[PDB]
Design a protein around this nucleic acid. Structure first.
Ligand SMILES: Nc1ncnc2c1ncn2[C@@H]1O[C@H](COP(=O)(O)CP(=O)(O)OP(=O)(O)O)[C@@H](O)[C@H]1O
Ligand SMILES: [Mg+2]
Ligand SMILES: [Mg+2]
Length: 347
RNA sequence: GGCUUUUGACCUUUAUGAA
RNA sequence: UUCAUAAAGGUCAAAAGCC
């Protein structure tokens, strides 16, 4: 049964039946992650005469957040290398480490330990930001898709709960404003992005799944011309924080609220102070700049240079058209045909 | 009320890499 | 000691499906 035909009272059942991970899926992925992690820690750089060390492999993305879609969520890994020493460095040397990681993976395949399938993407253009591939192992019951990124460890050993030293963002902003980049180093702060969602209430994670599924369904019609998926994820968090703040709430009202916020994209200016704030003048000046951009502005809680909004109003136009149609579906409607109603946003 | 799953919190333990 | 990935054991909670 398609989401498109599911009424409001069955959305939680729909999430349960199609979207939530089952035991096998999340078990096989964690096995696949283990294979790649061991490889990176025990093999991949053991050949370098000048030792390249991996300080940590961070499981990011939906996998680290607990918002994965069953049988559809990739594994996102950020591998932190001791020899990348700064944002400048990561930006210039990321290409090398990718290629090298590719070679060693090949040399493992050649050995019959597992099988990897990459996908050439042309034109190559700017250095690659990631290495993507599919993994297959006699060990595993299924294949898992991967996304691997090398990164400079800006945070050091970071403990969830603490705001990162502002001087780290001072430095971030300095390089970004000099090289004309914005949001290019969000991977270094993956752990903050993971922390922003990991501890949220269970049903909120479930709604995020639903919104993600709706968004993927939209992509069938619009390909890659939509705003970034992360924008919608953050938009869902914003909806809950201003309209509920409760562990229990109606999924349909949540769904409707999000769809309505999409239609109001020309008024969206959303940001958080979970990891930075206006205290430090430099960080403060950069936040303020971002909030003066054309709407919608959705500021990455982990990255003050990062407007997840995407800066492309055609994308939001397209997404808004779909939001208009989906508001006529049984998804947000009661039994009598009336809409369940959206939450109302605190200041 | 009963059965179970998913997602987190806290306290232990094992392997691997790193500071 | 701490950080990361996987596994194991104990305890607590949230939400969901089913009866
Ligand atoms: N536009 C963006 N700006 C900043 N960070 C982003 C971003 N897009 C993605 N990210 C970060 O990189 C992670 C991996 O992205 P994706 O794999 O593309 C989606 P996901 O969040 O993993 O869910 P999904 O893979 O289950 O669909 C995201 O969770 C987010 O933390
Ligand atoms: Mg992902
Ligand atoms: Mg990914």
């Amino acid at each position: 049964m398609e989401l498109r035909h599911t009424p409001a009272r069955d959305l939680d059942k729909f999430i349960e039946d199609h979207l939530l991970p089952n035991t096998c899926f999340r078990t096989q992925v964690k096995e696949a992650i283990d294979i790649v992690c061991r490889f990176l820690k025990e093999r991949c750089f053991q050949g370098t005469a000048d030792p390249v060390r991996v300080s940590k492999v961070v499981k990011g993305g939906s996998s680290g957040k607990g918002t994965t879609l069953r049988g559809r969520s990739d594994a996102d890994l950020v591998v932190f290398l001791t020899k990348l020493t700064s944002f400048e460095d990561q930006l210039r040397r990321r290409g090398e480490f990718i290629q090298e990681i590719r070679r060693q993976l090949e040399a493992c395949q050649r050995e019959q330990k597992f099988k990897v399938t990459f996908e050439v993407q042309s034109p190559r253009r700017e250095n690659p930001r990631a290495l993507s591939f599919v993994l297959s192992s006699p060990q595993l019951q299924q294949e898992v898709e991967f996304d691997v990124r090398p990164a400079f460890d800006a945070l050091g050993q970071w403990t969830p709960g603490y705001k990162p030293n502002p001087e780290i963002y001072v430095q971030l902003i300095k390089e970004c404003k000099s090289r004309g980049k914005e949001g290019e180093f969000s991977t270094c702060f993956t752990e903050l992005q993971r922390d922003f969602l990991r501890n949220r209430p269970t049903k909120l994670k479930s709604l995020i799944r639903l919104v993600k599924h709706w968004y993927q369904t939209c992509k069938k019609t619009h390909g890659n011309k939509l705003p970034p998926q992360y924008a919608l994820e953050l938009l869902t968090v914003y909806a809950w924080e201003q309209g509920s703040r409760k562990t229990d709430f109606s999924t349909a009202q949540g769904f409707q609220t999000v769809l309505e916020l999409v239609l109001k994209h020309q008024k969206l200016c959303i940001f958080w102070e979970a990891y930075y704030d206006f205290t430090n003048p430099v960080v403060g000046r950069c936040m303020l700049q971002q909030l003066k951009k054309p709407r919608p502005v959705i500021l990455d809680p982990a990255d003050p240079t990062g407007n997840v909004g995407g800066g492309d109003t055609h994308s939001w136009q397209r997404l808004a058209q779909e939001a208009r149609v989906w508001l006529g579906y049984p998804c947000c409607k009661n039994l009598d045909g009336s809409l369940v109603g959206a939450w109302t946003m605190l200041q």
